[PDB]
Design a protein around this ligand. Structure first.
Ligand SMILES: NC(=O)c1ccc[n+]([C@@H]2O[C@H](COP(=O)([O-])OP(=O)(O)OC[C@H]3O[C@@H](n4cnc5c(N)ncnc54)[C@H](O)[C@@H]3O)[C@@H](O)[C@H]2O)c1
Ligand SMILES: NC(=O)c1ccc[n+]([C@@H]2O[C@H](COP(=O)([O-])OP(=O)(O)OC[C@H]3O[C@@H](n4cnc5c(N)ncnc54)[C@H](O)[C@@H]3O)[C@@H](O)[C@H]2O)c1
Ligand SMILES: Cc1cc(C(=O)N[C@@H](CCC(=O)O)C(=O)O)ccc1NC(=O)Nc1c(N)nc(N)[nH]c1=O
Ligand SMILES: Cc1cc(C(=O)N[C@@H](CCC(=O)O)C(=O)O)ccc1NC(=O)Nc1c(N)nc(N)[nH]c1=O
Lengths: 290, 291
């Protein structure tokens, strides 16, 4: 039967590392880290995820504030607010929660956060440095998927991996982290990564996943990963979070639970790892390590 | 037998289009374009390739110069020279031929080239924008691989593609272009892409290539790709150039794969000349200050 990897317990340890690093940093004379979160509108999942992020900040010793603005805000007003925070010497990390209303250019907003405060890793310089295997702020969900793999001890070097999805914030960074060189400034997993997306016929997904030692699902389709697509003993990691009055991942949990070696549940899987790795990035930003 | 795609022929066509675009740019009352290539050291492959670039410049009506420096120059001296050329209004495109000596940080050098003169697409901003499917200077060899595919009508949407190699200048951009969305600012191929590299076990590589409608080899390994790894009718594009009496071959077993592939590029006369052609396109793009 498949080990159900506990995302809640792993994030507990990571957060414990952070609250210790933060306390050593404060004890030796430095400012306590501060994270600002800008939240636009009333997406219930957004508010819920921002709340998780600020609860986690408080219990690791990081100060935080959530600036909530109505969905009717103009792009120029958001860019003013971003620029004021970029110049607030108290603020170490600044992130704008996505998605943003249709009339606001998301990519303009992301590049307007100064890269030293860009704990999300969404600024184009952070994306480019990540893609060159340089030291960077790693985006939180891809770094969480990576930490799930590394702390569970699942090998990646020379192994086959399939990512479902190519979004610039989740799927593509996961694929980048997993195929790249262990020896580089920012190490990678040295795996053999296949990238599928909305134009991958399901038949051809199955022919690649049966070869996969690690299937990573970040598409947002319920029941996309089913037991006949996974080989015996493979690790399956569910980034998708779907509402079907219930919440489920992209994997068919019960069926793949029999077939797989490892699996991550939804909720309680990658979710709390996203919040944990954002805490790492905030203290990294407070140190001006980069 | 397989259709052999002549990269030499396609590149000379494209050079012709660039030439017409330059003459019109000049006839409209604009400065003739100028490309500067910086060459460090005496790698003979590097010298041969820069010579091919400056020849193509002359053919398409672009002024050029190669500035050769000994390998013993310092990083600071290269940056002084690069800053000089960034500030020369006569200079439209500027590239530093890779690889550089171990004491020169390649990353710092590529980021030192003004992004508007960055005809290699190597500046971290161009890399970042390419990886977000924004408009950017595409690097030359990946763009040549893309043109070979598109100008031959070889379809990519929903197809399986395997890239052998993951270098930031060649294999990674090729895999980024091929797997990304046709509907974004800079369109992608919408393919299903597998990236293999030096730790991919040869038997596992084979288990992917057999599903592949396109195989692209940028590993630098003679006879890496052999006819039993390829499915029938597939396209096989040989990015590698290996020296193996001295002879030049690709990563692909040309004669063997010739029999099962639907398409194939030769080495030499394949991707190489396409690299030089797309650099001419990027230089007229840079001269026009379009990005
Ligand atoms: C988490 O992770 C997801 C990240 O996506 P986002 O919200 O950032 O943007 P998004 O909703 O555009 O991302 C969905 C991704 O899944 C891909 N996809 C769609 N159908 C697929 C299929 N059949 N097989 C494989 N991939 C497919 C899409 O092409 C895209 O890359 C969220 O949906 C959430 O569940
Ligand atoms: O070219 P460069 O040498 O200038 O850059 P480089 O040194 O990074 O080599 C190019 C690429 O060849 C790849 N490669 C090496 N052996 C391979 C193999 N057996 N299968 C697939 N890829 C392989 C490497 O992993 C690398 O991505
Ligand atoms: C998907 C997700 C879930 C959770 C979470 O808390 N998941 C729990 C369920 C708890 C519940 O059900 O409420 C679980 O899965 O266990 C936290 C975070 C994210 N993802 C993001 O936050 N992405 C993101 C973004 N949208 N914008 C910016 N700027 N940066 C970002 O990283
Ligand atoms: C690999 C290659 C081959 C040829 C070529 O002429 N091939 C012919 C004959 C080969 C021969 O004459 O031996 C053929 O394949 O037939 C031209 C160009 C490159 N590649 C590069 O130049 N890459 C590159 C780089 N190294 N540094 C910077 N800054 N920018 C770059 O784009």
């Amino acid at each position: 039967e498949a080990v159900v990897i506990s995302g809640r317990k792993l994030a507990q340890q990571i957060k414990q590392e952070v609250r210790q690093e933060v306390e050593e940093w404060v004890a030796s004379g430095n400012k306590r880290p501060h994270l600002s979160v800008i939240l636009v509108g009333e997406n219930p999942a957004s508010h819920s995820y921002v709340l998780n992020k600020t609860r986690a900040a408080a219990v690791v010793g990081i100060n935080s504030e959530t600036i909530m603005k109505p969905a009717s805000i103009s792009e120029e007003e958001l860019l003013n607010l971003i620029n004021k925070l970029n110049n607030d010497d108290n603020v170490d990390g600044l992130l704008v929660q996505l998605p943003l209303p249709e009339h606001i250019d998301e990519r303009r907003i992301c590049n307007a956060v100064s890269p030293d405060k860009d704990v999300d890793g969404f600024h184009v310089i952070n994306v480019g440095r990540m893609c060159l295997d340089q030291y960077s702020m790693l985006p939180a969900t891809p770094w969480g998927v990576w930490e799930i793999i590394k702390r569970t001890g699942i090998p990646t070097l020379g192994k086959n991996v399939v990512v479902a999805g190519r979004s610039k914030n989740v799927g593509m960074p996961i694929a980048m982290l997993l195929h790249t060189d262990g020896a580089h400034e920012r190490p990678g997993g040295d795996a053999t990564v296949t990238i599928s997306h909305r134009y991958t016929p399901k038949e051809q997904l199955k022919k690649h996943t049966i070869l996969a030692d690690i299937v990573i699902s970040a598409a947002g389709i319920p029941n996309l990963i089913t037991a006949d697509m996974i080989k015996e003993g493979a690790a399956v990691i569910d980034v998708g979070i779907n509402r079907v009055p219930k919440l489920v991942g992209d994997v068919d949990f019960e069926g793949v639970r029999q077939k797989a070696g490892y699996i991550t549940p939804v909720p309680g899987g990658v979710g709390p790892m996203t919040v944990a790795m954002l805490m790492k990035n905030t203290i990294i930003a407070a140190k001006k390590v980069l």
